[PDB]
């Protein structure tokens, strides 16, 4: 108050640090109740009554509207985790908030924040280095069951948990079928190339995998056939309406006898184009642009299927899968226009199929490559959307596991081992960074506590047992195999999780630790706040 | 320990220590790209572009010949008010045939010099690249990059040694630049980025890619690197 006329509000001291810590803690507490296989869901209603049901951290934080920048930092952290990896967007927020909360106590004691920051950096580096000792090479394990177990662990705690084996088989089949042949330095697995469709109706265990492609489109006219056995596919990127001269050109008539032939040529040009296309034996014509009523009749008489308003990405995937070539014009390297039977796709069947009062198109057994699609059935739209969101995580996890052949046990074993190791390692520094390293180690231990709390069990007893076992593993080398005992939440006791089949990619842990440490530092460096009044 | 040598190298790559008296900091360009961590900041001794390629299919070229264009590959258009009048049905087909031939001639002329990479500057009055032209360029296996800004042409020429061309008659094999690699990379989720590296005529330019897990961190790191560059510039200005 008084000097420093700023026309705004400024806060300095422990007030702003406590306020920031409280904001981070509230953001963590919003999503803490959806962690682990025993986590539940959340319902969100907007101001018009639209209902969303989910337990995905990124989706929840994106749908919420927030006013505190310290909370917006965590929101963008979750979004970045979702973009980078695709799994574990709820654990990183909890870890970052716990790191802030534990560092704030040391800051309340007369400890300079720079020492805390350096200790956190050192601890993160050491933890990342140590995690490369708990690795499991997927080739050592049998590949199919390794992938199936990773998928099942990813899909646990979702609406599709009990159907884990069914949906995991579907996911692994789709991912393997969508594999791409690169320069052969590294094969690639481009997920999101698979089309996922939603249609309410029968039970979810009737969701199906299609070896081919599925289009949310219907045939152009009701007089056309709706099933083609041996399909020749032509993909086009232009409209098939009657011609119209450009803006620069205009028609001026001084001899009235010359109007009829111009009016006729206007309609004749497109008919000539269509005859050129059909002369090569094409059975199916896919077009992004529109098709005129006058031009549908040629297909109707020729006995061929025409589909309009096809999305460009769908056309690209169909063309690459069936071996066709996308054309934006019929011109060649000379003046004239030609269509060559060389640029035609081949498919083993094209059908129009009815699904719960609507229709869609199935293209089956493309010969150039292999393609896959998934059709999801559910009770209603909310269930279908949640199933799609839960399936995306499994697809991403399988892609990461296949790209990097390394897995890591789950259930809190990693956090317990890291806490023990960092607690032991903190002594060899013998400085004020020892306190920061110990705080990092202790804040790593929140995941098993949250799992046990959500399972309605004795968190203190379970975590004590885990720490004792991992300590006995880190000493007495002939008992190293005790470093894989995780946590069982359906019974309330430790169990060998690697043997049980609980696996995760290591990239999840590494990236989560790095991003959490960065966010904790960038929020811990703030000293005072100045907020300007709106105009 | 990672950012100091980058700054020193960036300053030493732009000046000539024998007689340099001042440093132009507009010769060093800072590019901010979200994702990753600060640890992923890097120095590029080449050209970096933030926009994507319009050519569907081609994304990597070795031993690239690059050309820069300041004219439009589209239908002919005079600066006076022009218009074509049609009074007979043959002219309707004749116009289309002539336009197609006109575009094809330019495409063949461009192909004649051996060009592999084409850059086109921004144009707002007439379409600078039509679908027919793009189709022909793709058929000739040339990678096309569009909407180059009108204010970084000097930097692009300084970096890769090219020479602007404003008339097709002047498109000749001596007006092109040579590069070892010209390709686009896809970061994990943030997007695409064009990199041109290994220039036969290396100018006195360099660029820096700054990463980070948050926009606040990215801007603060950019300001810190600017501070380091300014300190080195001051030390060049006064050897004390």
């Amino acid at each position: 108050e008084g000097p420093l006329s700023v026309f705004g509000d400024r806060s300095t001291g422990e007030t702003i640090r406590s306020q920031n810590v409280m904001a981070a803690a509230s953001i963590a507490n919003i999503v803490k109740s959806s962690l682990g296989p025993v986590g539940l869901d959340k319902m969100l209603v907007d101001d018009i009554g639209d209902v969303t049901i989910t337990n995905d951290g990124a989706t929840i934080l994106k749908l919420l509207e927030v006013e505190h920048p310290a909370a917006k930092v965590l929101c963008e952290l979750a979004d970045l985790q979702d973009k980078e990896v695709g799994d574990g967007t709820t654990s990183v927020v909890i870890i970052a908030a716990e790191l802030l909360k534990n560092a704030d106590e040391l800051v309340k004691q007369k400890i300079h924040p720079t020492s805390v920051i350096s200790g956190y950096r050192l601890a993160c580096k050491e933890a990342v280095r140590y995690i490369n000792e708990n690795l499991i090479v997927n080739t050592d394990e049998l590949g199919r069951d390794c992938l199936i177990n990773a998928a099942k662990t990813s899909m646990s705690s979702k609406i599709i948990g009990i159907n884990g084996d069914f949906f995991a088989n579907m996911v692994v089949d789709a991912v393997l079928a969508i594999k791409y042949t690169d320069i052969r330095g590294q094969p690639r697995y481009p997920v999101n190339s698979v089309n996922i469709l939603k249609a309410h109706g029968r039970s979810q265990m009737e969701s199906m995998l299609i070896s081919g492609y599925a289009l949310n489109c219907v045939v152009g006219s009701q007089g056309m056939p709706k099933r083609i056995v041996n399909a020749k596919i032509a993909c086009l990127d232009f409209s098939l309406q009657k011609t119209k001269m450009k803006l620069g050109v205009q028609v001026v008539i001084t001899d009235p006898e010359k109007l009829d032939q111009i009016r006729q040529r206007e309609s004749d040009i497109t008919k000539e184009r269509i005859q050129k296309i059909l002369a090569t034996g094409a059975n199916v014509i896919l077009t992004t642009g529109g098709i005129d009523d006058m031009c549908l009749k040629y297909f109707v008489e020729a006995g061929a299927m025409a589909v309009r308003r096809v999305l460009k990405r769908d056309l690209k995937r169909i063309a690459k899968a069936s071996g066709a070539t996308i054309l934006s014009t019929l011109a060649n390297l000379e003046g004239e226009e030609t269509f060559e039977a060389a640029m035609l796709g081949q498919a083993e069947e094209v059908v129009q199929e009815r699904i719960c009062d609507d229709e869609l198109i199935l293209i089956k057994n493309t010969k150039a490559r292999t393609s896959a699609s998934i059709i999801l059935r559910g009770a209603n739209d909310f269930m279908c959307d949640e199933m799609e969101r839960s399936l995306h995580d499994a697809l991403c996890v399988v892609k990461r596991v296949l790209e990097s052949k390394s897995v890591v046990p789950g259930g809190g074993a990693v956090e317990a081992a890291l806490s023990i190791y960092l607690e032991n390692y903190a002594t060899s520094m013998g400085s004020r960074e020892q306190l920061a390293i110990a705080e990092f180690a202790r804040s790593l231990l929140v995941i098993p506590n949250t799992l046990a709390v959500n399972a309605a069990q004795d968190s203190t007893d379970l975590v004590a047992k885990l720490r004792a076992f991992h300590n006995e593993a880190q000493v007495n080398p002939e008992r190293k195999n005790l470093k894989w005992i995780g946590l069982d939440l359906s019974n309330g006791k430790p169990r060998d999780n690697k043997q049980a089949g609980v696996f995760e990619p290591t990239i999840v842990k590494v990236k989560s630790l790095k991003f959490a440490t960065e966010a904790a530092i960038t929020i811990l460096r703030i000293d005072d706040l100045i907020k300007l009044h709106p105009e | 320990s990672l950012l100091s040598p980058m700054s020193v190298n960036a300053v030493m790559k732009v000046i000539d220590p024998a007689t340099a008296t001042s440093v132009d900091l507009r010769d060093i360009k800072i590019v901010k790209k979200l994702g990753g961590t600060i640890d992923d900041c890097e120095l590029v001794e080449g050209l970096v572009l933030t926009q994507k390629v319009s050519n569907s299919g081609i994304t990597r070229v070795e031993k690239a010949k690059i050309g820069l264009i300041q004219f439009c590959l589209s239908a002919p258009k005079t600066d006076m008010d022009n218009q074509i009048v049609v009074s007979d049905y043959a002219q309707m087909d004749r116009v289309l045939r002539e336009e197609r031939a006109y575009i094809l001639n330019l495409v063949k002329q461009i192909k004649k010099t051996g060009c592999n990479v084409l850059l086109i500057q921004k144009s707002i009055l007439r379409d600078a690249l039509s679908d027919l032209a793009l189709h022909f360029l793709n058929k000739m296996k040339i990678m096309v990059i569009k909407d180059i800004e009108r204010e970084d042409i000097e930097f692009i020429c300084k970096t890769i040694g090219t020479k602007p061309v404003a008339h097709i008659d002047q498109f000749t094999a001596d007006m092109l630049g040579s590069a070892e690699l010209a390709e686009e990379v896809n970061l994990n989720g943030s997007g695409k980025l064009l990199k041109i590296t290994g220039c036969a005529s290396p100018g006195k330019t360099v660029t820096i890619v700054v990463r980070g897990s948050n926009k606040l961190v990215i801007e603060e790191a950019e300001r810190s690197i600017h501070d380091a560059l300014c300190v080195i510039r001051c030390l060049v200005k006064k050897r004390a």
Partner: peptide, 7 residues
Amino acid sequence: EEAEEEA
């Protein structure tokens, strides 16, 4: 799309 290879 990530798939931006040969053609």
